[PDB]
Every structure is written in C-alpha cells, then in structure tokens.
Amino acid sequence: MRKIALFPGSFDPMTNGHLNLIERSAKLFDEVIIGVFILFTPEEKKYLIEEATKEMPNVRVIMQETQLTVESAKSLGANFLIRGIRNVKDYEYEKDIAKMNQHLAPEIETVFLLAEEPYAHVSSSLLKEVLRFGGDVSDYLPPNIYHALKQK
Amino acid sequence: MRKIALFPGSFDPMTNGHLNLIERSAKLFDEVIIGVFILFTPEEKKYLIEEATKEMPNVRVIMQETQLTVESAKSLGANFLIRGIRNVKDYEYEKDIAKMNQHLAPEIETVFLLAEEPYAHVSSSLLKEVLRFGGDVSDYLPPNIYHALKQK
Amino acid sequence: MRKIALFPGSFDPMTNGHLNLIERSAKLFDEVIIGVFILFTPEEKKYLIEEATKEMPNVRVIMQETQLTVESAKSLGANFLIRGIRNVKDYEYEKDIAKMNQHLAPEIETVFLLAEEPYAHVSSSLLKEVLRFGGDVSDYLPPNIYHALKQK
Amino acid sequence: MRKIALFPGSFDPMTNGHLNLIERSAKLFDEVIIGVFILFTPEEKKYLIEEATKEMPNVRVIMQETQLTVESAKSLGANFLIRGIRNVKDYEYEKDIAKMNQHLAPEIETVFLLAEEPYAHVSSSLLKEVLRFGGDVSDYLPPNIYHALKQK
Amino acid sequence: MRKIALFPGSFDPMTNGHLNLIERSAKLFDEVIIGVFILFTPEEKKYLIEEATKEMPNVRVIMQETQLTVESAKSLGANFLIRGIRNVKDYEYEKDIAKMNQHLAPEIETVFLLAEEPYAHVSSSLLKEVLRFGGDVSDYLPPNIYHALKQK
Amino acid sequence: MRKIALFPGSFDPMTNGHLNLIERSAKLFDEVIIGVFILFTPEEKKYLIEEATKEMPNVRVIMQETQLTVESAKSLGANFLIRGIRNVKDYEYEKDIAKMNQHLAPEIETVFLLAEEPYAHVSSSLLKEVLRFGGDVSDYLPPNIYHALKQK
Ligand SMILES: Nc1ncnc2c1ncn2[C@@H]1O[C@H](COP(=O)(O)OP(=O)(O)OP(=O)(O)O)[C@@H](O)[C@H]1O
Ligand SMILES: Nc1ncnc2c1ncn2[C@@H]1O[C@H](COP(=O)(O)OP(=O)(O)OP(=O)(O)O)[C@@H](O)[C@H]1O
Ligand SMILES: Nc1ncnc2c1ncn2[C@@H]1O[C@H](COP(=O)(O)OP(=O)(O)OP(=O)(O)O)[C@@H](O)[C@H]1O
Ligand SMILES: Nc1ncnc2c1ncn2[C@@H]1O[C@H](COP(=O)(O)OP(=O)(O)OP(=O)(O)O)[C@@H](O)[C@H]1O
Ligand SMILES: Nc1ncnc2c1ncn2[C@@H]1O[C@H](COP(=O)(O)OP(=O)(O)OP(=O)(O)O)[C@@H](O)[C@H]1O
Ligand SMILES: Nc1ncnc2c1ncn2[C@@H]1O[C@H](COP(=O)(O)OP(=O)(O)OP(=O)(O)O)[C@@H](O)[C@H]1O
Numbered sequence: 001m002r003k004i005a006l007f008p009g010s011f012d013p014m015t016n017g018h019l020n021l022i023e024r025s026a027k028l029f030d031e032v033i034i035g036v037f038i039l040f041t042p043e044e045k046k047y048l049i050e051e052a053t054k055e056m057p058n059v060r061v062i063m064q065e066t067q068l069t070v071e072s073a074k075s076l077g078a079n080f081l082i083r084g085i086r087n088v089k090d091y092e093y094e095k096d097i098a099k100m101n102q103h104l105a106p107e108i109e110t111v112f113l114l115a116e117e118p119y120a121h122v123s124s125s126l127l128k129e130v131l132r133f134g135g136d137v138s139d140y141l142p143p144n145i146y147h148a149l150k151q152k
Numbered sequence: 153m154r155k156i157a158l159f160p161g162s163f164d165p166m167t168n169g170h171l172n173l174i175e176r177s178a179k180l181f182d183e184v185i186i187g188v189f190i191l192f193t194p195e196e197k198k199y200l201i202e203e204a205t206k207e208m209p210n211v212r213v214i215m216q217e218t219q220l221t222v223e224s225a226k227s228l229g230a231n232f233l234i235r236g237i238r239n240v241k242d243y244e245y246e247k248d249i250a251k252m253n254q255h256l257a258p259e260i261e262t263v264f265l266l267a268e269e270p271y272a273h274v275s276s277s278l279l280k281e282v283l284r285f286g287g288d289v290s291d292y293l294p295p296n297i298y299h300a301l302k303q304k
Numbered sequence: 305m306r307k308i309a310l311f312p313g314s315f316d317p318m319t320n321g322h323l324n325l326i327e328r329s330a331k332l333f334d335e336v337i338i339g340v341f342i343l344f345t346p347e348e349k350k351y352l353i354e355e356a357t358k359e360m361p362n363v364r365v366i367m368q369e370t371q372l373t374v375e376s377a378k379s380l381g382a383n384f385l386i387r388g389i390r391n392v393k394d395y396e397y398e399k400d401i402a403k404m405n406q407h408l409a410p411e412i413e414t415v416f417l418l419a420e421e422p423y424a425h426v427s428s429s430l431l432k433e434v435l436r437f438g439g440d441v442s443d444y445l446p447p448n449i450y451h452a453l454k455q456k
Numbered sequence: 457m458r459k460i461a462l463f464p465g466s467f468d469p470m471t472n473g474h475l476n477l478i479e480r481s482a483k484l485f486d487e488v489i490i491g492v493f494i495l496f497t498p499e500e501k502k503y504l505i506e507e508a509t510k511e512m513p514n515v516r517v518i519m520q521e522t523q524l525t526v527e528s529a530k531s532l533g534a535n536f537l538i539r540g541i542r543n544v545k546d547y548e549y550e551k552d553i554a555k556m557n558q559h560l561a562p563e564i565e566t567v568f569l570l571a572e573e574p575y576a577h578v579s580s581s582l583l584k585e586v587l588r589f590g591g592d593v594s595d596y597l598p599p600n601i602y603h604a605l606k607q608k
Numbered sequence: 609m610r611k612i613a614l615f616p617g618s619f620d621p622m623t624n625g626h627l628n629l630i631e632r633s634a635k636l637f638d639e640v641i642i643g644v645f646i647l648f649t650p651e652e653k654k655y656l657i658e659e660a661t662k663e664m665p666n667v668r669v670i671m672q673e674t675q676l677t678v679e680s681a682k683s684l685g686a687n688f689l690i691r692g693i694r695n696v697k698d699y700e701y702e703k704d705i706a707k708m709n710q711h712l713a714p715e716i717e718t719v720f721l722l723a724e725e726p727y728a729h730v731s732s733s734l735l736k737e738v739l740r741f742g743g744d745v746s747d748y749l750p751p752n753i754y755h756a757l758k759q760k
Numbered sequence: 761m762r763k764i765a766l767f768p769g770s771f772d773p774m775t776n777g778h779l780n781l782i783e784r785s786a787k788l789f790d791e792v793i794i795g796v797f798i799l800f801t802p803e804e805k806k807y808l809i810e811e812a813t814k815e816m817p818n819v820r821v822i823m824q825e826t827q828l829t830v831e832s833a834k835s836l837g838a839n840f841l842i843r844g845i846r847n848v849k850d851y852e853y854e855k856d857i858a859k860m861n862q863h864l865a866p867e868i869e870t871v872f873l874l875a876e877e878p879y880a881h882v883s884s885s886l887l888k889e890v891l892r893f894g895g896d897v898s899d900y901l902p903p904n905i906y907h908a909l910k911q912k
Contacts, residue, residue: 003332005305007306028384035308036376068285080332085416086846087548091306091395092239095418099273102420104287109328112400112416116406117877121555133524135560153612153635176717179609180636220589232636232652237720240392244543247722248577254724259491261632264693264704264720265684268423268710372893391700396847408895422909425704437676439712459763459788480869484788487912521884536788541872544696547851549911553872558876565784566844568872572862573725679830695852729859741828 004075005029005080005111012040014049014144015127017119021084024113026056033076034061037069044148052142070105079108086115086123153231155182157263158219160233164192164263165278166201168292169271170267173236178208178263185228189221196300204294204304231260238267238275307334309415310382312373315340317449318353319431321423325388330360330418337380338365339373349451356446374409383412390419390427458480461485461536461567464493464520468507469601471583473540473575480569481538482512488538490517492526496604510600526561526605533562541570613640614686616677619644621753622657623735625727629692632721634664637688642669643649643680647736652756660750689716694723694730740749764791765840765871766833772800773905774809777879777889779910781844784873786816793836795825804908830833839866846875865897 005025011018011034025032034053036046042063049061064072070104072134073081081101085091115122122140129135138146157177163170163186177184186205188197194215205211216224225233233253235246250262267274271292279289283301290298309329315322315338329336337396338341338357339350350365357363377385386403389395402414419426434441436452442450461481467474467490481488491508492501495522505517518528520528537557539550554566569580575596583593587605594602613633619626619642633640644653644660650671661667672680681689689709691702707719723730730748738745739757746754765785765847769777770780770796786792796815798883810821833841841861843854858870875882882900890897891909898906 005398018166023454027413028307028415051599066285068282068287086396087552088392088395088544089548091389091392092241096239096273096275096278098418099303099421100278102284103289103291104282110418111332114402114414114416117880120877121552123552126552126556130556130560133522133527135524137559138455139559155636165545171694179717179718180611216588219589220586223590233749237699240544240696240699243693243696244545248543248579248582250722251577251725252586255593255595256586260634260724263636264722266718266720269424274423321870323814353826359709370893372895374891375893391704392696392848393700400847400883400886403881404886404890407897417750425707427704430704434676434712437674437679439676441711443711460772484763484869484871487901514816541851544851545850547845554874555877565787566874567788568874570872573728573859576725695856696848697852729856730854734856734860738828738860738864740803741826741831743828745830749873 002030003077003080004031004033004076005082006033006037006069006076006078007034007082008035008037008069008137010124011049011147012045014052015122015124016142017084017086017115017122019052019142020116020119021082021113022053022059023056025082026059029080030058031075031084032059032060033078035067035069035072036061036063037066037072038063045061048145048148054057068104070101070108072112073108074105080141081108081110082111084113084115086120145151154229155232155261156185156230157181157232157234158187158221158228158230159187160187160189160216162196162226162276163188163201164276165297166197166204166294167271167274167276169236169238169267171204171275171294172268172271173253173265174205175208176232178211181232182210184211186211187216187221187224187231188213189216190218191230191276200297203296218258222253222260225260226257226278228238232262233262235262236263236265236267241249273292274287305383305413306381306386307332307335308382309384309386310331310337310339310373310377310380311386312339312341315349315350315353316428317344317431317445317453318356319425319426319428320444320446321388321419323446324420324423325355325386325417326357326360326363329386330362333384334342336363336386337382338363339368339376340365341368341370341376344452353451353453355448372408374412376407377412379408385412385414386417386418387414388419390424420456423438442451458486458534459536460487460489461538462491462525462532462534463538464491464525464528464561466490466580467505468580469497469499469501469605470508470598471543471577471578472576472596472598473542473571473579475598476494476555476572476575477508477509477513477538477540477569478515482515485536485538486514488515489532489534490515491525492517492519493522493525494519504601504604507600521548524560526557526564530561537564537566539568540571541568609687610685611688612641612659613637613639613688613690614641614643614677614681614684615690615752616645616680618641618732619657620732621735621749621757622660623693623695623727623730623732624748624750625692625723625730627660627750628727629690629721630661630667631664633690634667635744638666640667640690641686643672644669644682645672645674648756656753658758659752660733678709678716682713687716689718690721691718692716692721692723694728708718715716728747761839763789763840764793764836764838765789765842765843766793766795766829766838766849768795768829770884771796771805771809772884773887773901774812775879775882776900777844777882778874778900779812779902780879781842781873782813782819785842786819789840789842790818792819792842793817793838794819794821795824795832796821796850797800797851798823808905808908812902827877828864830861830868833868834865839868841870843870843872844875845872846880
C-alpha cells in the first residue's frame with residue numbers, strides 16, 4: 001500500500017530548507033503531508049505553504065490542532081515521520097523526539113534527511129532575526145513567502 | 153574523603169532516570185542526599201521523592217533554600233556532587249558547571265554516571281510536554297509520582 | 305523515484321543492528337538491496353545474510369566487488385542509499401560521505417535511520433573484539449551468524 | 457592596508473574571557489573595535505569596557521545601536537569579524553552566524569580564536585548566576601567591572 | 609557494594625592526566641587498582657607507576673594480560689570501573705564501552721571523572737609525538753616517569 | 761609587529777579546501793607560509809603547491825624536515841599558526857594540538873578559519889578514496905594538481 005509520511009513543523013515561515021526536504025521527501029514517499037502544528041496566521045500560514053508546494057501533486061498541507069505528532073500521523077494513516085538534521089544540535093534534539101515517538105507509537109518510523117549544504121545554516125528563527133534588521137534573505141525563502149514576509 | 157554525595161536537581165517531576173541514578177549512586181556512596189533546589193512545589197516533591205526512594209536506607213531528601221550547590225554541599229558535609237550525562241548537550245553543560253563548582257569549592261568532587269539507555273532520552277520537560285497532550289509516559293515515572301501527576 | 309534502496313557494507317559479521325535497519329527499511333522501500341562489498345568467505349556471507357533476512361520478501365542480498373557505492377547503486381537500479389547513525393561520530397562521518405555521493409550522483413538520495421537504542425553501541429569491530437575474548441554477545445547477532453561465528 | 461576587526465558581543469558584563477580575546481586579537485589585527493550590540497546604562501557599559509582596555513592603543517569601543525553586525529563592520533571599514541569558541545555548542549552557533557554573515561557580506565571574513573583554558577567555562581550568564589548567589593567570581597572579571605558590579 | 613575500583617589502561621606512558629584521576633579516585637574508593645594491560649617492559653612500568661603513586665596507601669598496581677576488562681575486574685574483586693572523559697570524542701567512545709561492559713557484567717558500575725583543564729588535551733600518544741621531536745612535556749609527566757622516559 | 765602565518769599540513773594532495781584557506785588568510789596576514797611537512801614527493805608537492813598559488817604575492821611554499829610545528833614557525837618568523845575546522849571532529853583535534861602548541865610556545869597564536877560550505881566535506885583522503893575508484897573530483901582539486909594526479 002501507499003507509504004505516507006507526515007512532516008511536522010512550526011513553519012513560521014516555511015524556508016527553502018523545509019521546501020528542499022519536502023521536494024526530496026516527495027520522491028521517497030507516495031504522499032507527504034505537511035503538518036503545520038500550531039508567529040503567523042494559520043489560515044494563510046497554510047495558504048503560503050500550499051502556494052509554495054503547488055508543483056508537487058503528492059504533497060498537501062494540513063493544520064493540526066495541538067496534539068501529539070504521532071496521534072496526528074495515526075489518524076492520517078502516516079506510518080512515517082520525516083525530519084531534517086542540519087547539525088549536531090538538531091541530531092541530538094531529533095533523536096530524543098524520535099525515541100519518545102517510538103515509545104508512543106512503535107509502528108511509526110522516523111526517517112531522516114540531512115540538510116543540503118546551501119541551507120544547513122538556515123532556520124526560521126535566524127531568518128526572522130536577519131529580516132528584523134533589513135538583511136536580504138530572499139535566496140532562503142520561497143518567493144511567495146518572501147513577498148508576504150515583507151508586509152510584517 | 154567521607155563518602156557523602158549530594159544529587160542536586162529540579163526533580164520537576166522526578167523520573168525513572170533520576171531514580172536510576174540514585175539507585176546506582178546508593179551502591180557507591182555511604183550516603184546519597186537528594187537536594188531539591190527550589191512548577192510542582194517543594195514540600196510536595198520531597199514527600200514524593202522520599203516515597204519513591206524509601207527502599208534505600210542510605211538515601212535521604214532535603215529541600216534546599218536556593219543557594220550555590222557547593223555551599224549546600226558543605227553544610228550537609230557532602231564531598232561529592234553526583235551528576236548524570238545523557239548526551240553531548242548534558243556533557244558540555246555539566247562540564248562548565250563542574251568547572252565553576254571546582255573554582256568555588258576545589259575540595260568537592262563532581263562524579264558522573266551515564267544514563268542507562270532506556271532513559272537516555274528522558275527529561276522532566278519532555279515528559280511534561282508529552283503528558284500535556286495525553287501521552288502515556290507511565291513507563292518513565294515512579295508509580296507514586298505518575299498518579300500524583302495525574303491531578304492535571 | 306522507484307523505491308529501490310541499497311544498504312552497503314561489509315557485514316563481517318552482520319549484527320542485529322544492521323538487521324534492525326533492514327527490517328525498518330523493508331517497511332518503506334519496495335526493494336532493499338543488501339550490498340555486501342568484498343572475516344568469512346563471500347559465499348558464506350551471502351548464505352548467512354540471506355538466512356538472517358529470509359523472512360523479508362522485499363530484501364535481496366547481492367555481493368559486489370569494492371567500488372564507488374553510487375556506481376554499485378546505479379548498476380543495481382537503486383535510487384536510495386540507506387545509512388544508520390548511532391552517534392555524533394557516525395553522523396559527521398556519514399554526512400561527509402553523503403555529500404560526496406551527492407556530488408558524484410545528484411540523482412541518488414541518501415536516507416538516514418537512527419540506531420534503535422539497544423544497538424546504538426553495537427558495531428562489528430566492538431563485537432569482534434568482545435568475541436576474541438569469549439564475551440557473550442549472542443544478544444547482538446542473528447542466531448545463525450552467532451553459531452557460524454563460534455564454529456570458526 | 458589596515459586589517460580592522462569588529463568584535464561584536466553583548467558583554468553583560470564583559471569578562472576576562474572577552475578580555476583575553478581582545479588582547480589576543482589586538483596582536484593579530486591592526487585595529488580592534490569592540491561593538492556593544494545592545495543592568496547598568498550602556499552609557500557606562502562602554503566606559504567599563506573602555507576602562508578595562510585602556511592599556512591597549514589599537515582597541516576602541518563603540519555602541520552600535522542594534523543593526524546587522526556586518527552593516528556595522530562595513531561602515532567602519534572592518535573587513536574582519538573576530539569570534540571566540542569555548543566548546544561545541546559555541547562552534548555550531550558561531551558557524552551558522554558566520555555562514556549567514558558570509559551570505560550578507562561576502563567580503564567580510566569571520567576569524568575564530570579558541571578560549572584559553574582557564575576561561576573555557578566562562579560566560580557572563582554563568583557568572584551572573586554565581587554572583588546572584590554570593591559566589592566569588594572576582595578572578596573571572598576585570599577588577600573595574602567586578603567593583604562596578606557589586607551594586608544593584 | 610565494596611568500594612573497590614579498577615582503573616584500566618595502557619599507561620604508555622602514564623601521564624599527569626592519569627595520575628590526576630587516580631588521586632581523585634583514591635578519595636572516592638576504599639581501594640583503587642591500576643590495571644596495566646600489556647615502550648617499557650611490564651616490570652619497568654609497574655615500578656614506574658608504583659613509584660608515581662607511592663604516596664597513596666589505598667592504591668595498588670596490578671599487571672594484566674589483555675582481556676575483557678570486566679573479567680579482570682571480577683577476578684580482582686572490583687565492583688567499579690573508573691574512566692576519564694576529556695572531550696566529546698572520549699565521551700562517545702567511553703559511552704559505547706560502558707554499555708558493552710554493562711551488558712557483559714550488569715553488576716559492575718562504570719564511574720566517570722572529567723579531565724581537569726590543565727590536562728584536558730593530554731593523551732599518552734600526543735605526549736609521545738611531542739617527545740620524539742624534543743619538545744618539553746615534563747609538566748605533563750610524573751618526574752620519575754619523565755626521567756625514565758628520557759633514557760632511551 | 762608584522763603578521764606572518766605558517767599553514768602546516770600534509771597536502772597529499774592539496775585540495776581546493778586548502779587553497780580556500782590560503783586565499784582567505786592571505787588577506788589577513790602579511791605573509792602566509794605553506795609548510796609542507798614531508799605518499800608524494802616533496803619537489804613535486806612544492807612545485808604543485810607553488811604553481812597552484814602562483815598569483816598570490818604574500819604566499820610562500822616551504823617544506824620542513826619534520827620537527828615540532830612551533831619550532832619550524834619560530835624559525836620562520838611566524839607568530840601565527842593558521843588552521844581550518846570542517847566539523848566537530850576537526851575542532852576537537854585542532855583544539856588539543858593548539859593547547860599543546862600554546863604550552864610549547866605561548867608566544868605563538870593559533871588562528872582558525874571555518875571551512876566554507878562547498879568544501880566542508882572535502883579531505884585529501886576522502887578524495888583519494890574516490891579518485892582510486894575513478895570518481896570525478898575535479899571540482900575539488902586545483903587543475904594542475906588534478907592533471908598531475910592522472911598519471912599515478
Ligand atoms: N534548512 C533546513 N535544512 C534541513 N532541515 C531543516 C531545515 N530547517 C528545518 N529543518 C527540519 O525541518 C523540521 C521542522 O523544523 P521547524 O520549522 O519545526 O523548526 P526550525 O527550523 O528550528 O524553526 P525555528 O528556527 O523557528 O525553531 C525539523 O526536523 C528541522 O530540523
Ligand atoms: N533520564 C536521565 N538519565 C540520567 N541522568 C539524568 C536523567 N535526567 C536527568 N539526569 C541528570 O540528573 C540531574 C538532574 O537534573 P534536572 O532534573 O535538573 O534536569 P532535567 O531532567 O534535564 O530537568 P528539565 O528537563 O526539567 O530541565 C542532571 O545532572 C541531569 O543531567
Ligand atoms: N547498531 C547499529 N545501529 C544502527 N546503524 C548501524 C549499526 N551498525 C551499523 N550501522 C550503520 O549501518 C551502515 C553499515 O555500517 P558498517 O558496514 O560500517 O558496519 P559497522 O558495524 O560500523 O562496521 P565496523 O564497526 O566493522 O567499522 C552504516 O551506515 C552504519 O552507521
Ligand atoms: N570565556 C571566553 N573565552 C573565549 N571566548 C569567549 C568567552 N566568552 C565569550 N566569548 C566569545 O566572545 C563573543 C561575545 O560573547 P557574548 O558576550 O556575546 O556571549 P556570551 O559570552 O555567551 O554571553 P552570555 O553568557 O550572556 O550569553 C562570542 O563569540 C563568544 O563565543
Ligand atoms: N589527561 C587526562 N585527563 C582525564 N582522563 C584521562 C586523561 N588521559 C586519559 N584519560 C582517561 O583515562 C583512561 C585510560 O586511558 P588511556 O590509557 O587510553 O590513556 P590515553 O592517554 O588516552 O592513551 P592513548 O594515547 O594510547 O589513547 C581513559 O578512560 C582515558 O579517557
Ligand atoms: N576542505 C577544507 N576546508 C577547510 N579547512 C580544511 C579543508 N581541508 C583541510 N583543512 C584544514 O587544513 C589543515 C591542513 O589539513 P591536512 O594537511 O590534515 O589535510 P587533510 O585534508 O586533513 O588530510 P587527510 O584528510 O589526508 O588527513 C587542517 O587544519 C585542516 O583542518
């Protein structure tokens with residue numbers, strides 16, 4: 001049957017780094033569900049992501065009212081969690097999360113992709129800090145999300 | 153030196169990880185003092201922690217009015233500080249703490265135990281986050297503390 | 305991409321760690337190729353490994369002469385490389401290898417699974433050394449391989 | 457031409473570890489500019505630092521109202537950013553910051569010095585925690601900042 | 609359990625780093641055994657190490673032929689293994705070894721001490737590379753071993 | 761003080777990674793001395809390196825009968841050692857070496873540059889592994905060093 005992955009994240013905003021994982025994931029799984037686990041306005045926080053990922057048929061976006069990531073996956077039929085690692089810090093953090101998730105839902109596998117080097121230093125928090133000071137970070141954001149980020 | 157050890161921590165709440173450390177420490181030192189160093193409240197912790205440790209004759213619990221850990225050790229006559237390391241992050245954090253403590257009190261030794269891998273991913277804050285969303289983490293808490301915790 | 309994966313290694317011997325990654329990989333990929341790159345005999349390894357993974361319809365074992373992993377993958381039709389990470393040292397080593405493979409074959413994706421904590425300390429070279437001295441590591445090897453190991 | 461370095465930091469307060477970096481980079485660069493990228497009014501944080509660095513002719517202090525570090529460097533003709541690394545956490549954090557600053561200002565080079573061992577565990581944050589509790593960290597502070605510090 | 613500890617190593621040669629751990633260990637255990645697992649001949653090494661530790665009455669030196677550390681401990685009545693950590697590399701290495709030893713002998717506890725900063729960078733191998741080139745590392749070797757070492 | 765830096769390394773072969781550090785530090789130092797510590801032939805090494813660094817005025821190539829690095833630097837007038845860090849492994853390794861060099865020659869400063877993204881996974885040895893199997897690493901070597909490597 002279909003191999004379905006949930007890609008949980010804060011995504012405020014979604015960056016080219018997230019998008020890169022989504023593009024690579026879309027080749028690995030039959031379906032990728034982007035889970036916006038809820039600073040931004042979801043109604044369009046989800047719209048931005050949908051816009052940014054429109055050229056990929058097997059990807060969709062979902063808002064999830066706060067709950068355990070695994071319970072969200074279960075109710076979606078996702079047997080796979082997909083996560084990214086950009087450095088040692090992510091690794092140790094994602095490792096604990098994935099063990100906890102394994103304890104909570106042993107049937108769900110967490111799968112890892114490493115950041116592509118162009119984006120290994122990119123995170124939304126660093127990006128927001130640079131923009132808050134006028135720095136040009138357009139090369140790290142999807143055009144539409146960059147457009148929208150300006151209005152803030 | 154006298155084989156007396158202080159095990160300082162928040163224990164908010166105490167996990168099986170802490171407990172594991174205490175059990176192993178009880179085998180090494182003549183006395184193990186658990187120092188609850190004050191959102192679960194102080195008087196509460198103590199009773200719970202005593203309740204969970206009652207089967208170890210050489211373990212006892214004290215509430216320590218906020219102060220330097222090494223001054224608290226001196227008062228109690230503890231010559232050893234017991235810490236646990238579960239990953240690189242703890243290692244670097246505990247290492248700086250131990251160096252500062254050695255500057256403040258060179259006669260006091262910091263001793264380290266590594267997490268027993270069933271609990272390497274376990275911390276009170278991760279447990280708290282998982283409980284918030286209804287996760288079952290009873291395998292990670294002493295029964296007494298789990299129940300008392302289900303009053304949320 | 306076609307869900308065809310290569311899991312490259314020397315597997316001398318294969319451990320429950322490798323087996324564990326193969327089992328989890330088998331839930332995701334249509335085809336998991338165990339690529340044994342040529343201390344037993346080639347024909348013996350293949351037999352041991354096929355025997356240890358016979359319960360999995362979508363796993364195959366293929367002996368390969370040493371060469372570029374991505375050349376092996378391309379010969380066999382694999383679009384994915386499966387790697388495991390048991391600690392920081394593996395992470396940093398695997399990341400360099402993955403980036404190099406990305407340079408050599410951009411169309412091949414390296415996918416990562418984290419060691420299941422019971423085997424996180426296990427590698428063939430720690431096992432060998434323990435075996436050299438009569439240590440009981442039967443918990444860490446497929447029973448067919450552990451038997452074979454004693455024999456010689 | 458002159459090699460000029462900006463040394464950005466919150467210096468809250470400046471410690472002997474900072475002072476050690478400043479002294480060492482004062483030998484490496486023709487000029488070093490300490491940038492207090494904003495307790496005691498920074499109107500005095502600048503004086504504290506100025507006082508502490510008096511015996512070094514090629515060192516200046518400026519308060520850059522918060523702005524992109526590289527923008528500050530550019531407007532001062534500083535083609536070098538000087539950073540310290542105490543540990544792995546520092547390394548990964550500074551590395552992301554240097555990669556972003558490279559993207560923002562490719563002509564500016566980030567240069568790193570390792571902490572000298574007596575100060576490797578020293579942070580303003582740790583010092584403040586110890587000071588809060590009465591601990592003696594006078595060895596970790598320039599005399600003038602220590603004095604100016606025991607008043608709140 | 610009996611506060612008897614084994615401190616296993618090659619001690620080729622024994623460094624002030626080693627000596628530092630032994631001194632600190634002699635304060636914690638009733639008996640510390642330096643297990644020297646076979647530059648110098650066994651008899652020389654034993655004399656060297658005995659000479660270097662003769663100031664500590666609860667320290668003893670035993671030569672041991674290479675074998676499982678935990679069975680050497682079992683033969684000698686040691687319930688504790690004492691190990692040092694000087695960096696992340698050491699931590700990950702000792703962690704795997706401690707987990708294996710725990711699997712081989714669950715009743716044996718491995719206890720860790722962090723390197724004292726002066727010696728954090730000190731290993732026998734590095735010390736030897738510096739020695740072969742004439743560099744003065746006398747500050748890093750007990751005098752008797754230093755003297756002995758500069759006679760060949 | 762005039763700023764002259766020694767860049768010690770094996771350089772078999774020199775990569776675009778090394779070249780990258782040389783270009784960057786040539787902008788920081790009055791003189792950069794490439795110290796080839798002598799499988800490759802030195803006359804070769806030197807000519808290859810000198811040719812790959814032809815159009816940098818303040819860059820000089822030298823080979824050292826091997827001796828302590830800080831001795832070779834003192835001989836040359838180099839008050840600075842320049843190193844690169846690609847990852848955590850490099851960092852811990854270079855940190856030990858730098859501390860040992862601080863101890864041997866406290867007057868000599870070790871200065872660090874972080875690898876830039878394109879080359880952070882590149883090392884001579886990983887390169888050789890790949891070359892030795894016909895992989896294309898021409899993007900990672902200076903063109904002359906690349907042609908000269910065809911023959912072997
Ligand atoms: N640039 C990137 N490259 C690869 N993976 C990434 C990147 N950014 C985030 N990820 C991974 O995507 C997942 C979701 O990240 P998420 O947006 O929740 O946190 P984050 O990027 O740290 O955001 P913030 O900085 O706002 O905390 C995580 O596994 C994260 O490690
Ligand atoms: N599961 C565990 N296994 C081994 N050691 C642990 C474990 N949890 C905590 N420790 C160690 O025991 C001591 C108690 O620490 P403390 O309870 O303050 O931290 P913590 O559990 O990380 O708390 P929090 O997550 O609430 O910040 C610390 O030295 C910590 O590293
Ligand atoms: N116990 C384990 N858990 C998870 N992943 C593992 C485990 N052992 C090996 N791997 C991963 O599987 C792949 C094959 O590993 P490899 O062939 O190097 O075996 P190894 O046991 O590390 O070998 P050796 O110890 O002999 O060098 C690598 O990506 C490795 O990191
Ligand atoms: N003891 C030290 N030795 C060497 N470098 C240091 C030391 N303390 C800080 N630095 C470096 O100096 C720069 C400025 O540090 P800064 O004061 O901004 O942060 P910090 O020291 O972490 O302060 P805080 O603890 O308040 O966050 C950073 O690059 C930091 O790594
Ligand atoms: N300077 C030091 N400070 C603290 N611990 C140390 C130091 N040197 C070694 N140790 C620890 O003491 C134990 C014995 O180590 P070992 O005999 O391997 O010494 P070593 O110097 O690492 O030897 P080698 O250079 O051959 O690896 C190990 O656990 C090691 O990590
Ligand atoms: N690609 C790179 N980017 C940045 N720094 C580098 C790079 N390659 C090497 N260096 C640094 O340059 C210095 C010289 O390194 P060295 O001669 O050991 O080359 P190496 O590539 O590590 O060799 P090998 O991998 O064959 O052992 C070291 O400090 C190393 O960390």
